[PDB]
Amino acid sequence: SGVNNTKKWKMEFDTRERWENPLMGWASTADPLSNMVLTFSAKEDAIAFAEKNGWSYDVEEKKVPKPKSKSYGANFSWNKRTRVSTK
Amino acid sequence: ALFVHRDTPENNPDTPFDFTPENYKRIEAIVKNYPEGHQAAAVLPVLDLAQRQNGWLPISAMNKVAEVLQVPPMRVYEVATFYTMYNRKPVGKYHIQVCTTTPCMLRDSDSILETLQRKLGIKVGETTPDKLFTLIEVECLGACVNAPMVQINDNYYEDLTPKDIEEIIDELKAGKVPKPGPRSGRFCCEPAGGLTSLTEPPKGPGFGVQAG
Amino acid sequence: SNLIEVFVDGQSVMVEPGTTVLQACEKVGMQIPRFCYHERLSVAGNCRMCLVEIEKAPKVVAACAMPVMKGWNILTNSEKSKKAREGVMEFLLANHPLDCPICDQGGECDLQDQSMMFGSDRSRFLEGKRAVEDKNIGPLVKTIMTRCIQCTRCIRFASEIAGVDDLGTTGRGNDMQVGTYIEKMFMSELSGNVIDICPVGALTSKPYAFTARPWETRKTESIDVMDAVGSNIVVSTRTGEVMRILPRMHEDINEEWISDKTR
Amino acid sequence: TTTYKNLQHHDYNTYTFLDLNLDLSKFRLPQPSSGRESPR
Amino acid sequence: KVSPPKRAEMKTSMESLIHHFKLYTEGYQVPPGATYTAIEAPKGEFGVYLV
Amino acid sequence: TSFGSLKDEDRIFTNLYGRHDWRLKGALRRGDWYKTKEILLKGPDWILGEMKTSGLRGRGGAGFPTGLKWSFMNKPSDGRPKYLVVNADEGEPGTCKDREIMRHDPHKLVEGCLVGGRAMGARAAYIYIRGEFYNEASNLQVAIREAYEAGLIGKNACGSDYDFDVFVVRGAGAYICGEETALIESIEGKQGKPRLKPPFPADVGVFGCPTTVANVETVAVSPTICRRGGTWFAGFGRERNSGTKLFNISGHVNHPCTVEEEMSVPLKELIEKHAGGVTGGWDNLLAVIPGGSSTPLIPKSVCETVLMDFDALVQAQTGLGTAAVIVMDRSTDIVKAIARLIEFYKHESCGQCTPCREGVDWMNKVMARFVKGDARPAEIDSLWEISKQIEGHTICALGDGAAWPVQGLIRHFRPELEDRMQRFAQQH
Numbered sequence A: 001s002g003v004n005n006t007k008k009w010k011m012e013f014d015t016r017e018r019w020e021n022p023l024m025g026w027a028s029t030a031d032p033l034s035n036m037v038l039t040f041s042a043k044e045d046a047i048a049f050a051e052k053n054g055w056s057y058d059v060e061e062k063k064v065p066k067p068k069s070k071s072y073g074a075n076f077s078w079n080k081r082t083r084v085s086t087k
Numbered sequence B: 001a002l003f004v005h006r007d008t009p010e011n012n013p014d015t016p017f018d019f020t021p022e023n024y025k026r027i028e029a030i031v032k033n034y035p036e037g038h039q040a041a042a043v044l045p046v047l048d049l050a051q052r053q054n055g056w057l058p059i060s061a062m063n064k065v066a067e068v069l070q071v072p073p074m075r076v077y078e079v080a081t082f083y084t085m086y087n088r089k090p091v092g093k094y095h096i097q098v099c100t101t102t103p104c105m106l107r108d109s110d111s112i113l114e115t116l117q118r119k120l121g122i123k124v125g126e127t128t129p130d131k132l133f134t135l136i137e138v139e140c141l142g143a144c145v146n147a148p149m150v151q152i153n154d155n156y157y158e159d160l161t162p163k164d165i166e167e168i169i170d171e172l173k174a175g176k177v178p179k180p181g182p183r184s185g186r187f188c189c190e191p192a193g194g195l196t197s198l199t200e201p202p203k204g205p206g207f208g209v210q211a212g
Numbered sequence C: 001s002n003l004i005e006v007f008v009d010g011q012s013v014m015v016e017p018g019t020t021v022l023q024a025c026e027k028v029g030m031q032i033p034r035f036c037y038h039e040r041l042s043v044a045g046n047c048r049m050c051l052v053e054i055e056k057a058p059k060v061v062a063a064c065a066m067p068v069m070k071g072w073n074i075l076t077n078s079e080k081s082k083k084a085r086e087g088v089m090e091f092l093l094a095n096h097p098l099d100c101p102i103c104d105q106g107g108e109c110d111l112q113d114q115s116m117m118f119g120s121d122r123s124r125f126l127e128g129k130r131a132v133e134d135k136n137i138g139p140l141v142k143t144i145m146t147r148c149i150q151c152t153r154c155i156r157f158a159s160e161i162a163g164v165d166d167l168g169t170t171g172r173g174n175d176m177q178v179g180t181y182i183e184k185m186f187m188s189e190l191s192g193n194v195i196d197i198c199p200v201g202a203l204t205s206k207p208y209a210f211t212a213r214p215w216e217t218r219k220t221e222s223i224d225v226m227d228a229v230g231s232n233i234v235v236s237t238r239t240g241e242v243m244r245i246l247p248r249m250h251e252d253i254n255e256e257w258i259s260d261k262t263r
Numbered sequence D: 001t002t003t004y005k006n007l008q009h010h011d012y013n014t015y016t017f018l019d020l021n022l023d024l025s026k027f028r029l030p031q032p033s034s035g036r037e038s039p040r
Numbered sequence E: 001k002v003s004p005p006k007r008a009e010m011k012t013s014m015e016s017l018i019h020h021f022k023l024y025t026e027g028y029q030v031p032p033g034a035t036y037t038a039i040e041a042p043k044g045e046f047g048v049y050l051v
Numbered sequence F: 001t002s003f004g005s006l007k008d009e010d011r012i013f014t015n016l017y018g019r020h021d022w023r024l025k026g027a028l029r030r031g032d033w034y035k036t037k038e039i040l041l042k043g044p045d046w047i048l049g050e051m052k053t054s055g056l057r058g059r060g061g062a063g064f065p066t067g068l069k070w071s072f073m074n075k076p077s078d079g080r081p082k083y084l085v086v087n088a089d090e091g092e093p094g095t096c097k098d099r100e101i102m103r104h105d106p107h108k109l110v111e112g113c114l115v116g117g118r119a120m121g122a123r124a125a126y127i128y129i130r131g132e133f134y135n136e137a138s139n140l141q142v143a144i145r146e147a148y149e150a151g152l153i154g155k156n157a158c159g160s161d162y163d164f165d166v167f168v169v170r171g172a173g174a175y176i177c178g179e180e181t182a183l184i185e186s187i188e189g190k191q192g193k194p195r196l197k198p199p200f201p202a203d204v205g206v207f208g209c210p211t212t213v214a215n216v217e218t219v220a221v222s223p224t225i226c227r228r229g230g231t232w233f234a235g236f237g238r239e240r241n242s243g244t245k246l247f248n249i250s251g252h253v254n255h256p257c258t259v260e261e262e263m264s265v266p267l268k269e270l271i272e273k274h275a276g277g278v279t280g281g282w283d284n285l286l287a288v289i290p291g292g293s294s295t296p297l298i299p300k301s302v303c304e305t306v307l308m309d310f311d312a313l314v315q316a317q318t319g320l321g322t323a324a325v326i327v328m329d330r331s332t333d334i335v336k337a338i339a340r341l342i343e344f345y346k347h348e349s350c351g352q353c354t355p356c357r358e359g360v361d362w363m364n365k366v367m368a369r370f371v372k373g374d375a376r377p378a379e380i381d382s383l384w385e386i387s388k389q390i391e392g393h394t395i396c397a398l399g400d401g402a403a404w405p406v407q408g409l410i411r412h413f414r415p416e417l418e419d420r421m422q423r424f425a426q427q428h
């Protein structure tokens, strides 16, 4: 339920082949540029950083959760339909 | 004790149990004891109504309650795993549960436990081969004053000596329920040889009316 | 305008009524620990870990439930709001079976941290733990209910998001144990979401039983298929392979979770 | 009086209690309704 | 949280197990900050600008 | 003053341990149902008016003020009815008081559900009760039918507009159901799992409807405290702690009793005057309890000068709850006893709060090791420290009832434990 990994603007890159090393069973690659996390602080700065190196950025926006009303007593209504069971 | 089912044959959800129609007619009094909605609230006496038609509430009888009430079956077990008054295991005829908390312990209930244990075979919490007595070490019973204390499925025997327990059980095996009540003569909770509070005929009606 | 002055170490916040202390403190960032609470399930203070000293009070309040009135100043890092936690986590960790390396949820435990972040170093518990029987729900969901923490965060899923009412709480005391009283299989839609919910690794997914460990994953965010909802997903890789399916939070599609088929 | 006049609690069966409320439903008024039949 | 516990003590006392499971995976979780330490090794002012 | 005698004219729960028609036709003989008409018709706000002037505080564990508690719902309509509830569940080890007032004067109880029901404004009262009290509770429905036969309840409170009924509900033997709220959920037909208290019972309770969770004394006193007190009744006890009280005594005594006196009497006289003195003498009386069980100990160093006020005892570090007095003499294993109380709460608590599932059971194991003495002493102040980790960390005040028996045991009898630490230490 912890959410500190949010508040940031990681800019990982796409993935490419990860073949199986036929000797050991190991996994190996060609693209060194795959494990390339980068922590930013605002989206307006990220595009400025990637455009500054010409890379075809592809943004996804924030997904803010709503502020929800959760009233404990409404679990225990006379009229209504939220009458919980098992306390 | 284990608080979960193990679908034995004698305790499977197809055993013979069903409320006699006298008992159905007792339900609709209890569901008109509680409002139209919230008819799922009668679970305590209703499920206890089966306890009195028979001990050892089977899995099937619990599931019957859901049928009369259309409550989820799981919400039946929740109650029956919780309260100690009910009985899910095959119990005896008498269910002689006893206090062992401090004031009744302090008044030598262990001897009442020994004399009772010494003469039946049941250590603490199991049956006789006759299926009559199922001793239980329970904790309090409300009558903490009349200090030694037991219970016979609804009754109350109190102020009972180690000698008096022998007097009891010699009757129950081949007799009747021998007068639920205290010994040493104290009526309910008299001061045991001389009463001191009332000592008079109380005041009749309208004594001390504050001008209403 | 239906807003209430509320204080958090001096903040001048304004919040709608009927809001907890969390929904206030969550604005700023004073993220409070959580075991009984989810942002979508009913409220029930059973864990009693979200405690805090409201200013000018001898008693603390379960912030999961206590709404927020005018003029209230909170002290999240008080001595009394940490003593209230170092004790609690030092209670939970007295019947828990030390199975972290066994546990499916190594880095995905919301208890290991919250014993580190706020729990103490030492478990003075030295008497002897308890045990609990293991269950046989089904092939999707393993059960280790020796480490269940009586949080009620599962049984309030079936009863308010899937409509089943079978995973009751059986018993009392430490002797209490969640699970059916009987031997029934909870193989219905959304039954797999219960794994993401149990923060403890008590119950967890049999397919991803032990195939991996979460820090090892390289997580890629992608979309459901196989139903026309097009809900969202977190995919878990390991060395160019696949091990889990996990959901993202979009507030419109599904809400937070997925169905067992695409899991 | 020095005689125990609560004597009439020994000769009760296990059904005696609820058998009384079987009678009481006639002495009683009708009850509310939550609109619903139950929480369904 | 800053040192691993006694190996006989991680093996019964729960909390010492969890820290042992997170020290050797995650670790200390330092605060942000910065230093320039120093020490005269045989060479001289060996020091670290850990950030 | 030097009160404590209570000339028997002011016995309020007469036929306490007695006879002579507990049934109807003889409760009327004692003074009951007499002026219920204008007691009822005059008004609710008048009744809550007088009860506050009566200085009648709680009679369960908290001693909370009435009037206040009931005036929390004198509200106008909201859409759904107003109920009333009674803790006929005695509970504690020592409280037999409500195994007695039920029989021997049931009608007085019935008044308060009726009178107090309109003094708040209600529709119908439910009496949960301990599911062991079968023949006990059976005495009620006999009394309650005859009420309806007398036209006293049902469309007509003695011939008035305030329709009302007195339904009774049977528990299943659980001390937590004696609590204010899980009671409501037990009555609701669920596990006895309590609630949290921004939704007070007066805003939402049984059936999602508001309630007044009274106890037996606070209501059975209502008829003959409102027609015969309000200012007179206040003269008894003391200023905050005014009234009378159905005390009860058990343990290491000649004649244990259920006596009631002018409240806040000094503790010594309750063992001297009534309920004849402890066995042996007064080098005996090792570690009394004033309250039932959720109150701490008292080491006889104060038990001379005790004054049984709720609040003067808070200098004594106890809080008078049910006032089910327990007494202990010299020749005892006290740590066996006080540990049984944690063996009691272990078998008992609902198992919902984290620091009661495994705080109580945790203390159970520790004290159980102290009785044998094969522990070590450094726990003795740790075990204190955890007792403080449960005070304000639990839904219901059981934790306050499960901690204080220990803290009081430790506030005085630290060294008695230190001996057993040495006695075993000799045994390797």
Ligand SMILES: Cc1cc2nc3c(=O)[nH]c(=O)nc-3n(C[C@H](O)[C@H](O)[C@H](O)COP(=O)(O)O)c2cc1C
Residues within 6 Å of the ligand: F057, F058, F059, F060, F061, F062, F063, F064, F065, F066, F069, F087, F088, F089, F090, F091, F092, F175, F176, F177, F178, F179, F180, F213, F214, F215, F216, F218, F396, F397, F398, F399, F401
């Ligand atoms: C664990 C626990 C058990 C309790 N059991 C009872 C009980 O059995 N009977 C009772 O009257 N009160 C019991 N109480 C106290 C009730 O809250 C109290 O009786 C009730 O609030 C009535 O308050 P009053 O005295 O103002 O009427 C219990 C409290 C706790 C914490």
Ligand code: SF4
Residues within 6 Å of the ligand: C096, C097, C098, C099, C100, C101, C103, C104, C105, C106, C109, C110, C111, C112, C147, C199, C200, C201, C202, E018
């Ligand atoms: S739930 Fe699993 S990972 Fe978390 S503390 Fe318990 S055993 Fe360790």
Ligand code: SF4
Residues within 6 Å of the ligand: C147, C148, C149, C150, C151, C152, C153, C154, C155, C178, C197, C198, C199, C200, C202, C203
């Ligand atoms: S199984 Fe998990 S979610 Fe369910 S009660 Fe136990 S700890 Fe909570």
Ligand code: SF4
Residues within 6 Å of the ligand: F176, F193, F194, F348, F349, F350, F351, F352, F353, F354, F356, F357, F394, F395, F396, F397, F398, F399
């Ligand atoms: S303190 Fe114990 S008995 Fe009271 S609500 Fe919490 S778990 Fe239940």
Ligand code: FES
Residues within 6 Å of the ligand: B099, B100, B101, B102, B103, B104, B105, B139, B140, B141, B142, B143, B144, B145, B147, B149, F092, F093, F094
């Ligand atoms: S303590 Fe023995 S009956 Fe209550």
Ligand code: FES
Residues within 6 Å of the ligand: C033, C034, C035, C036, C037, C044, C045, C046, C047, C048, C049, C050, C051, C062, C063, C064, C065
């Ligand atoms: S996290 Fe708030 S009471 Fe559980």
